[PDB]
Amino acid sequence: TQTTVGDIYTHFFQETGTVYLQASVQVTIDAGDEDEDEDEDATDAAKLDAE
């Protein structure tokens, strides 16, 4: 999901709760081209929250 400046996004963290985030600089949320293979840490949701 591609961020756009001035917009508002919302998310819920598995360990701290829900929160609303306003993007300030356009960026790709996922990792750009990262968060695969080398992680070997946890579930899909826990990977998104870390990023």
Binding site: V5, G6, Q22, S24
Partner: protein, 51 residues
């Protein structure tokens, strides 16, 4: 049954403190992307990682 209330908030004058003059003589004193996002001088926040 429902509840309703109106509060409103506002930035402080000289908050940015990097410019010597207001933009348009009369300007909104309410926080926004172009006036309050990470530009205030009254507050600094630093993450702590390692503990």
């Amino acid at each position: 049954m429902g509840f309703k209330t109106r509060y409103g908030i506002g930035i402080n004058p000289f908050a940015e403190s990097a410019a010597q003059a207001p933009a348009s003589r009369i300007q909104s004193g309410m926080p926004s992307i172009l006036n309050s996002l990470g530009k205030n001088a009254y507050f600094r926040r630093v993450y702590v990682k390692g503990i």
